[PDB]
Amino acid sequence: SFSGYLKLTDNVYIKNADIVEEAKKVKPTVVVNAANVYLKHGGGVAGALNKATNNAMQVESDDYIATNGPLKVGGSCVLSGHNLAKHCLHVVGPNVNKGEDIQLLKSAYENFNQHEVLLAPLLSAGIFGADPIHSLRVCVDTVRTNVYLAVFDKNLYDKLVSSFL
Numbered sequence: 124s125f126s127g128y129l130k131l132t133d134n135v136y137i138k139n140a141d142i143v144e145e146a147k148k149v150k151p152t153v154v155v156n157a158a159n160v161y162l163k164h165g166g167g168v169a170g171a172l173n174k175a176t177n178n179a180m181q182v183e184s185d186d187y188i189a190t191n192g193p194l195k196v197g198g199s200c201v202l203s204g205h206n207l208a209k210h211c212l213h214v215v216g217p218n219v220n221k222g223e224d225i226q227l228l229k230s231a232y233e234n235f236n237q238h239e240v241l242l243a244p245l246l247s248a249g250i251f252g253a254d255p256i257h258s259l260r261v262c263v264d265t266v267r268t269n270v271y272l273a274v275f276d277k278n279l280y281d282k283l284v285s286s287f288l
């Protein structure tokens with residue numbers, strides 16, 4: 124189904140790809156969003172996925188927050204995948220740039236175990252400020268379901284693969 128991924132472990136795969144383009148092509152059952160507790164999809168993966176939905180993700184997310192309140196750091200919710208996937212699993216990894224606890228990254232990845240297969244970014248990486256090498260390590264040590272990681276940055280992808288233990 125997913126093409127061109129490098130197998131890291133029994134269940135973790137990685138590719139240098141734009142997660143928006145991966146989602147449009149594959150139309151996976153689940154695309155993971157690098158969400159914040161307010162589901163305000165301003166930038167990074169969230170801003171990019173929301174822009175690909177023509178803001179439908181943000182409109183749906185605002186209604187979800189109006190009804191349910193904010194998510195917890197380390198938590199998630201399942202919403203529509205719009206034109207990108209059947210569902211979007213909005214997962215909140217800790218944002219180290221907001222001083223959040225990096226220990227919550229394992230809790231964030233545990234949300235992936237509720238889905239047999241997912242297309243996902245590295246949680247807390249990019250604008251969330253965590254070390255992406257550490258994120259990949261927590262991913263491989265926490266996620267047991269099939270996760271296809273899309274890493275937008277080629278230089279970061281090369282660093283992640285070449286340093287993977």
Ligand SMILES: CCNc1ccc(C#N)cn1
Pocket residue numbers: 141142143167168171249250275
């Ligand atoms: C070009 C649109 N796609 C993407 C994918 C990932 C990120 C990040 N971070 C930003 N844009």
